[PDB]
Design a protein around this ligand. Structure first.
Ligand SMILES: [Cl-]
Ligand SMILES: [Cu+2]
Ligand SMILES: [Cu+2]
Ligand SMILES: [K+]
Ligand SMILES: [K+]
Ligand code: NA
Ligand code: NA
Lengths: 620, 620
């Protein structure tokens, strides 16, 4: 009966039925996005209304629509035609991808380019990439994909080893036209294979790894009820899944004595962008909005026991819609388990003679997704001590190019003649805050150095300061690692026993933000990525830092547009958007398949509790 | 056998015998420091000379000595009388700590101060703390400790809950004289207890935690030979232990095919300082050099299986000297084990149809020490992919004071009337580098943003730059998180298959460095802590960033003196000294016993290998 339960297969097929009966799902229609809407503020006063939001594409050229349906009542709430030149194109369809390679295969310009390089067209894979918005006026209002070529020598070959540089094509996937083929000149196609399962490349496998057995003889310490409601070590939350964002956490709360205390209303990765920093016209347009354009949830992997998730694992198998409105289950797409996490607290006291040690553990909720060459793990952690953490694990195969003769300031060499263009992977965590309820505020906290002199005669003093962010115009903040800058979300109307507002402190990794020139298209379309921390006033329709329709949007959508409202955020229902990313200069060690690298952030209680919340943990 | 083996009980007894025979260890002498020295540069074979260095204190007040002994040859190599007012006092003797409370208990000034506060002297514990160097001219050349009082209500009471503010005493621990008692006025002694094992405070203990069993049915994947030589998953190293530094790693190397490739010759935490930022004269002198003044290894805990170290644990029990030269074992003082570390690499390729997942592991070498109220865990990690990481874990009970009525800019409130002065915990890792051998250099690498314009018309390009640090004068560097600054140690004479010098990249956390005014005693004494990275030319007598004798020693020694030599570090035998630390504004959640917080750094291979070094890891 929880309004935060996962979508059922039946709900999705019910959406399909409502749509088709309304005449909105004819044979030329495709569902580009489908997801359940969260309950509105103040909805608990009963009366479930499960609503779904749908983006409908038309492959015949007709206008797309955004449609909201009520599966509870079997109705279309709203159906609005979209002007895509104005508000953006719909997300890339899984089925539109193959289209690029197929169209190019019969194009004379493309065939000429391949023939000059002596490449068999049957062996040429084309990565179907998002187009962005550049100088091509003819592209406005059209659904475009750009294509880069990779040679696959045989069915099981890794095509990423064999990029075809100096060549790029643009295609209109609706009219099925190749609009441009650009050939800037031949580059050798790197010849070494990157087949990481080939014994010739791996060498003899290690026989030195002895098993590590992780078991829970009495089962896990968390409970799962209503399908996706988790309770674990004082924590309470609901695990949602959306085809765009992936795993979403709802209603994160902590049972402190007799009270269930809210902390975060909704936590998600609301966007992730991969901008490339190679100025070659072959790739200078390349920016993947893995979340906004591709939809990371739809490509979530089925996770294997003992392989992807080790120990005592509880799985969720979320359901999503295919292009036609049929429900598809992602079997074992979400892993949930608790992990030992070393020492929690320890002291050996001379005076009392008491030696005390307690161990820590964390609850893990994760999924793994594949976006073309990339594979990402998204992990949320809840710790015994009240810490909340997110970690992204980036792996897969790096996106390759030729390595230019004479070297490059923008590309690293992975193998002979094989390049890897510099790029970033930049995430936005959207945290709809609810510290002890919805009346919250954010302060920026900096360390403050003090000058030796009166009141500080030994020059040892240091302090800190907090600045309240009172309005959205003041709430776009940057990191300052040197001054230990953090941000505290507090509830000015809820105080701890020492009469201080309860709070949680956000600790960022202070990695570089978006490096592109501020006047670039990517800086405008991924404005969120240019600053570390944004705070907005909550609004139903402000879901993504990049807006609803990211694909081929001209820029300025999302956060810059929200912030421009300059709303009061001082003791109000607010949302924190934290930008954090990896800046990737690929190394030889990343080839032919990359070891995981990580980035993330955490929040720790800051006078939220009246004392340590883990004094009741028993000895191991 | 190996010159890097742990000191044995017999060796320590033999050093005692050699010193005795030489007339250097009569009944008035005490061993303040004793440790084995590393072999000299210049190989050997098995022509070993095990040498020990000793600092010898004299309880009658005669000059102490620094002595090097050859235990192999039964000889004194060198013995020098120290002028401590110049070069520094010896580390504090465990036996001197108790002297303070004992002497104060009969001092009329101390008794009067306690009587003014209605405190029973029998219940007043005194934290006997290092003195540093301030304006008290009479202390020059004397061994002083400063005492701060805490009330202990009964034998098992946590005295830290009951600080006695406004009171401090200074004590000469050799002449056994109370030199000063300062009373700045009475403060209420906080009354709430901080007894974290009292069920009244813990409430009923949780019954919700189900067991997590971690076992290795076939034993661990690492081997231990020669007592302390570890081989694990291509890694080779020797685990040393020194009473001052604690665990020291020697000869870290990686077997890459048929070649054992050195990476780091010696890794240690060569100093750690805990400066306090409260300008009250009661504490404004407070700075712990846990390593240099206290010797962290000597207070290493015995680690309990199932509590401190979970899984299949192999222990080392290092031997140290007592104050008289007798050997003492720290049973189970070092834990060694491997643990699962999630996903190593993963890719699901659409074009090839191959789905690939491998798991990661790390080797862990750790110890835990107790310094009064604080307990610190020191953890070294080696990863399958070649990453090396250090992590410090800070816990224990925070150091307390009164909380001033009307608040404080330098102290936080933990409980009614109970304060916790702001402070930092700053570590120095000394990494004697040997990237593919001793011919090394360091480059500072920064991200480079590029301007939109010719050659970058879309404004997407970004790059990086590297600056070789050629001489020590140029090798004192600061963090720049905003520009993604890292430091690469490379070997300009050893190139990978792509003709690039092999390297490792140091990734810092970019936490704040020492906050004290540069004119302070602590800024001079902990000069190393004011900058993030220092590079020196290797020298036998350059061991600690603070010099050999830190206790009551002014500036004049350590890193700032070493760097002045302005030696060539461009393709030479070099040492990297990385400063990293926590800035602690204590929170209510830290009381009455603090949950672990962490800080550290890592190094990742950077074109060290010719491709990923983990292609030979088998499927799980
Ligand atoms: Cl990548
Ligand atoms: Cu990358
Ligand atoms: Cu601290
Ligand atoms: K537009
Ligand atoms: K001998
Ligand atoms: Na909110
Ligand atoms: Na070196």
């Amino acid at each position: 009966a929880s309004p935060f339960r996962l979508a059922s297969a039946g709900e999705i097929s019910e959406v399909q039925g409502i749509l088709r009966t309304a005449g909105l799902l004819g044979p030329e229609k495709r569902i580009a996005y489908l997801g359940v809407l969260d309950p509105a503020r103040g909805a608990g006063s009963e009366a479930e209304d499960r609503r779904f939001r749908v983006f409908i594409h038309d492959v015949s050229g007709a206008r797309p629509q955004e449609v909201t349906v009520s599966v509870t009542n079997g109705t279309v709430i709203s159906a609005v035609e979209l002007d895509t030149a104005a508000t953006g194109e719909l997300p890339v369809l899984e089925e539109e991808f193959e289209v690029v390679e197929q169209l190019l295969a019969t194009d004379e310009r493309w065939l000429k380019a391949l023939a000059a390089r002596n490449l068999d067209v049957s062996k040429v894979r084309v990565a179907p990439l998002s187009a962005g918005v550049f100088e091509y006026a003819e592209e406005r209002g059209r659904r475009i994909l750009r294509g880069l070529a990779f040679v696959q020598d045989f069915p099981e070959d890794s095509a990423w080893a064999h990029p075809v540089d100096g060549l790029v094509a643009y295609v209109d996937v609706v009219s099925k036209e190749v609009t441009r083929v650009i050939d800037t000149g031949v580059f050798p196609v790197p010849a070494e294979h990157g087949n990481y399962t080939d014994p010739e490349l791996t060498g003899p496998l290690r026989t030195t790894q002895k098993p590590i057995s992780i078991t829970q003889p009495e089962g896990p310490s968390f409970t799962v009820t209503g399908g996706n409601h988790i309770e674990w070590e004082k924590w309470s939350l609901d695990v949602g899944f959306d085809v765009r964002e992936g795993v979403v956490l709802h209603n994160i709360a902590f049972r402190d004595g007799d009270r269930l205390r809210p902390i975060i209303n909704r936590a998600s990765i609301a966007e992730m962008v991969v901008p490339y920093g190679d100025p070659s016209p072959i790739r200078s347009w390349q920016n993947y909005f893995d979340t906004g354009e591709y939809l990371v949830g739809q490509y979530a992997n089925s996770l294997e026991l003992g392989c992807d998730c080790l120990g005592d694992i509880t799985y969720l198998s979320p359901v999503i819609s295919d292009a036609f409105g049929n429900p598809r289950e992602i079997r074992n797409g979400i892993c949930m388990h608790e992990e030992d996490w070393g020492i929690l607290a320890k002291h050996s006291d001379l005076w009392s003679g008491i030696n005390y040690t307690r161990r820590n553990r964390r609850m893990v909720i994760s999924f793994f997704t594949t976006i073309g060459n990339y594979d990402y793990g998204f992990y949320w952690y809840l710790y015994l001590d009240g810490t909340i953490e997110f970690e992204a694990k980036a792996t897969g195969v790096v996106f390759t190019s030729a390595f230019p003769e004479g070297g490059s300031d923008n590309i690293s060499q992975l193998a002979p003649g094989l390049g890897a263009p510099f790029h970033q992977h930049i995430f936005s965590a959207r945290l709809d805050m609810a510290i002890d309820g919805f009346t919250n505020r954010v302060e920026e906290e900096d360390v403050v150095r003090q000058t030796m002199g009166p009141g500080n005669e030994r020059g040892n003093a240091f302090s800190r300061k907090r600045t309240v962010l009172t309005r959205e115009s003041e709430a776009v903040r940057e990191a300052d690692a040197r001054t230990g800058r953090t941000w505290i979300i507090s509830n000015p109307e809820s105080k701890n026993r020492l009469n201080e507002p309860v709070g949680y402190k956000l600790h960022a990794h202070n990695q570089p933000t978006l490096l592109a020139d501020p006047g670039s298209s990517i800086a405008r379309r991924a404005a969120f990525a240019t600053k570390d921390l944004w705070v907005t006033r909550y609004a139903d329709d402000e879901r993504y830092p990049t807006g609803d329709f990211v694909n081929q949007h001209s820029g300025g959508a999302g956060l810059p547009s929200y912030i421009a409202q300059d709303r009061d955020i001082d003791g109000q229902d607010i949302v924190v958007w934290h930008t954090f990313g990896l800046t990737h200069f690929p190394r030889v060690e990343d080839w032919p398949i990359m070891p995981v690298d990580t980035v993330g952030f955490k929040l720790r209680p800051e006078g939220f509790f009246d004392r340590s919340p883990v004094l009741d943990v028993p000895a191991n």
